[PDB]
Amino acid sequence: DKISHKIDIPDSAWTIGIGEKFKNAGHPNVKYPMIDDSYVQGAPLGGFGAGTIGRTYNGGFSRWHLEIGKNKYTTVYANQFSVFQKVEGNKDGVAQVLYAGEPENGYLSSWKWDYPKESGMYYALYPNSWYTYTNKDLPVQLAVKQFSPIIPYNYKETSYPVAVFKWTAYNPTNKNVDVSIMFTWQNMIGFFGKQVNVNSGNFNKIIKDKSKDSEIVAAVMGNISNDNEEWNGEYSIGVKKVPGVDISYKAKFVTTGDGSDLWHEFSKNGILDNKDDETPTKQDGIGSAIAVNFKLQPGQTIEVPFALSWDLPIMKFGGGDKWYKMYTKYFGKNGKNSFAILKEALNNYQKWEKMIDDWQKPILSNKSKPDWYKTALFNELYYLADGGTAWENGKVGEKRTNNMFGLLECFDYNYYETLDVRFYGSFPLVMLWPDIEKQVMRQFADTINVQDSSEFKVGSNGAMAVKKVQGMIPHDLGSSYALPWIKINAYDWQNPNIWKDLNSKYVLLVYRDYVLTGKTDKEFLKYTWKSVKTALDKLKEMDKDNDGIPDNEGIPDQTYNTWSMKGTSAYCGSLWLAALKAAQEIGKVLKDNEAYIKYNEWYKIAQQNFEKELWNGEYYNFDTESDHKDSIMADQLAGQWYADILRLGDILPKDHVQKALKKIYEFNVMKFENGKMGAVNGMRPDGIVDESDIQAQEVWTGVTYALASFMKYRGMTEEAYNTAYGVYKMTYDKSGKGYWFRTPEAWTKDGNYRASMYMRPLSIWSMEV
Ligand SMILES: [Ca+2]
């Protein structure tokens, strides 16, 4: 490996061998069907709301999130980079697809598949990833840096449906070598969203944009239809000329054939036919190819950028609503703009790399932080793009000021912005894209007084329940299978209108968003204040025994819904105390004296009673009335965690919080698989896991990272990082279970998982407050 020295990969990049088999991978631990796409994954390409494309560490374009809200795992084999090399003095060169695999059927059988093992590495530090190719049959060593312009405090480039592939080639030998790099792509119009005739009318064109010191050559793969539908649009691939390289292309090869129409050209001398052909296809799949060819002398390096763009302007949800995607603000809505997007990337990618470096540098340059922590911090951000992200720029046929946004809980539980989950998972948004975060919270504020009296059948027990109660915050903002933003509370497994935690979490999120954006946004507090007061006032009505605290009912009524809480619980009770303190503070900011006095009075009574009912001398009891009331809960002081972040001070005595956190480390972490897998949710005082429910026996990855941040804030530095380390190890390490770029909600002691590709572990960013 002589190429690494010619590129700059950070030491904290996650690494794996190209073609590496992983032996220890986990699988779903539930009886019901659950997504398991394997460990062959990678960092995604594409901006927020653009649809994303997962290119895996084996080189394949395999995890397709282009249909917003859906996860489709299938390798499109025509989509590849390939290389040709010929040493000066040899009769023949060699050609090789840079993919560690081969097609299942006989399509593309002429291509050289099965990129060999131990011949290159994949690296990832989101939004960047890299491949290096160090192969005994390829005298010239190659590397590529691939990324999309995902940039904090930038709502423009961050939205773009584009990726850049910056190639570096170096000749460490003492002979001249001819080299070609080829990008192939299938015309994927009709891959989704088209009910019949899936390739019909697809056609490919070549664009040559020649100006001074810019030549770009690109293929635009579109359809002859000018219809404005979810399925229609364009893909483009292309390259920018650099000194010392020539460009060749092939506009049309058949992907549903043996591929030799293209490969006989490339494998001879790395130079394509330059054949244009705009003939539309009928049943056959078609694709395009863009190549560069160059000669490298001994010791010579060259850099050449390729790009990929996709203009699919309309997203459609299962309930029928069609919306324009955010990037259409910058490029248009007609679906004929892929070249414009590609050109912007090829002319500006160096600027974008520097913008990414500028945001990563403060963390990467901090030598007090271990590299593993940086690995997790950056790579967990994959989910912001990969989580079915929806970001609208108008309803099809509709202009408003704001652009609604949603991130999925996950794909198995296909709900947008699940409130309980975003209480943990929304840290990167408030910290790095706060205008999005505040928009999402205004969306929630708008729902507070919505009433929908129609009943639905509750999944868990078959009871009928009211859809949406006035004054109760919704569980979620809809599903991609239905009507995101329009039809809320798509979730039906339980009834969230009786939950005792959501209204408090909502209030805490509001005050968080004010505090973490500088305590200056009084207009945001003004917009949300009525909903805050409503939320707390409705919760107060659920105090049955008049101790000042809403009562858990011993039936599903908070996020740990099968792990029953009854009476006053540490979890809901602490969240309540913190929400009351937050609302007092908002009251002072907005000069709402009567609110300040009321919530101060409620707070004083509740705090007193919480302490008497639950403090046992070592930790806070799980609750007052369950059979498992003395369980040590990892999340017992979630309200105090958020109070630290919101700078609300002590809601509980410092000494008791310290004892509680120490107990949690001692038990839930260190007595669970030797502290190497995170914090199990529930443990009995005898040191054995609470077996009263499956949820108690799970580590929740996002709960564990949040607990680590709480420990960190309280000065328990070793315990904080040791606690978080288990989650990193399980996710990314060779000794873990192979969950990179699909971090799940939970695992059990065997390492097997529930709900891969989950929002909650974005909570690692609470460690950066
Ligand atoms: Ca009560």
Author numbering: 31 to 428, 431 to 801
Report text from the authors:
The TxGH116 structure contains an N-terminal domain, formed by a two-sheet β-sandwich, tightly associated with a C-terminal (α/α)6 solenoid domain that contains the catalytic nucleophile, E441, and general acid/base, D593, residues, which were verified by chemical rescue of alanine mutants. Here, we report the structures of Thermoanaerobacterium xylanolyticum β-glucosidase (TxGH116) D593N acid/base mutant in complexes with cellobiose and laminaribiose and its catalytic mechanism.
Indeed, the activities of the D593E, D593G, and D593N mutants were reduced by 36-, 3300-, and 140-fold relative to wild-type for hydrolysis of 4NPGlc, respectively, and in the ranges of 250–900-, 20 000–36 000- and 39 000–44 000-fold for hydrolysis of oligosaccharides. The decreased activities were verified by kinetic analysis of D593A and D593N, which showed ∼30 000-fold decreases in the apparent kcat/Km values relative to wild-type. In all structures, the acid/base residue was mutated to asparagine (D593N) or alanine (D593A). The D593A and D593N unliganded enzymes and D593N complexes crystallized in the space group P21212, isomorphous, with wild-type TxGH116 crystals, whereas the crystals of TxGH116 D593A in complex with cellobiose and laminaribiose crystallized in the P212121 space group and had 2 molecules in one asymmetric unit. However, the loops of residues 523–534 and 583–597, the last containing the mutated acid/base residue, as well as the side chains of D452 and Q727 in the active site differed from those of wild-type TxGH116. The distance between the catalytic nucleophile E441 and mutated catalytic acid/base N593 in TxGH116 D593N (10.6 Å) was longer than the distance between E441 and the catalytic acid/base D593 in the wild-type TxGH116 structure (8.5 Å).
